[PDB]
Design a binder for this molecule. Sequence first.
Ligand SMILES: CCN1CCN(c2ccc(C)c(C(=O)NC3(c4ccc5c6c(cccc46)CC5)CC3)c2)C[C@@H]1C
Length: 305
Amino acid sequence: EVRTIKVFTTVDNINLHTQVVDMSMTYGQQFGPTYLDGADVTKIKPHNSHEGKTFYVLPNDDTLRVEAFEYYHTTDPSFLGRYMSALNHTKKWKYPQVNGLTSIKWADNNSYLATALLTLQQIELKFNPPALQDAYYRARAGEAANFCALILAYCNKTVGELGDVRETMSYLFQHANLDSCKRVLNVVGQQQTTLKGVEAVMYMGTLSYEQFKKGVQIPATKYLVQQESPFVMMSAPPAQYELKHGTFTCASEYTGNYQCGHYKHITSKETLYCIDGALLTKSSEYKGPITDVFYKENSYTTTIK
Ligand SMILES: CCN1CCN(c2ccc(C)c(C(=O)NC3(c4ccc5c6c(cccc46)CC5)CC3)c2)C[C@@H]1C
């Protein structure tokens, strides 16, 4: 007794393809690996309630492959299942709007994701993968489940695993349009270097944009000659630090030990705000263990001869 229902399949949720599914067989039997709003349905059999719904199915035909590459800018066959797997959790996360920004209530060690999401709403980033563009616009508004599930998928991270914020930005930065970004550095006889792309906007070793401009000791003195970017990201191993209102855009606080601690996010707005997931405190001065600081920028040229 052969019953059927109509569903849609997709790899990108923009191009829907209509499917008739035998209610007697499993989705996997008919589509291969198959997901519904994250939940893997590959060994379960169609339900009546399934009529009309969209189902994610790994690209098996060259059409789906093309649609898939064009949406994610990856060909990694495991990507879609990882995104769906991550998505099955992040959809249960809560995303409060703390301070006019979208955060994440703590869960499964997602403090790092929260801090990067907050940061990503405060700086000028144009994503090239449409998936990320679309996921980010929704996350700005308050629905950040997909952006977060994509971030894990691109960065090959499991739910529950604490990630490193600097490393994530780096990954994301490589999927964003930072081609126009330029950095000129001089070391001191005098040896000048030119950086571009993600290397133009990132530095490990000091938290202070002012120090970078004044002069940093190295194994000699390195100093910033020219910055052409919308922001710069100053990182360094965690260290006690005074954050002064108006002198930065935002910053990552890390308390704890290597690969087993906890991130908070500090934002300079009308005052210093500490966004700890769903929790929020306010202080005019802040001092704490900091490892990333962001500063907005347009164009900067040294005055050093
Ligand atoms: C590809 C190799 N990756 C090495 C780093 N891994 C990782 C994962 C998760 C976290 C929270 C941290 C971390 O804890 N990152 C921070 C950090 C804390 C403490 C110390 C740090 C030092 C250097 C630099 C950062 C530090 C010295 C002491 C907070 C920035 C790192 C990811 C990966 C395996």
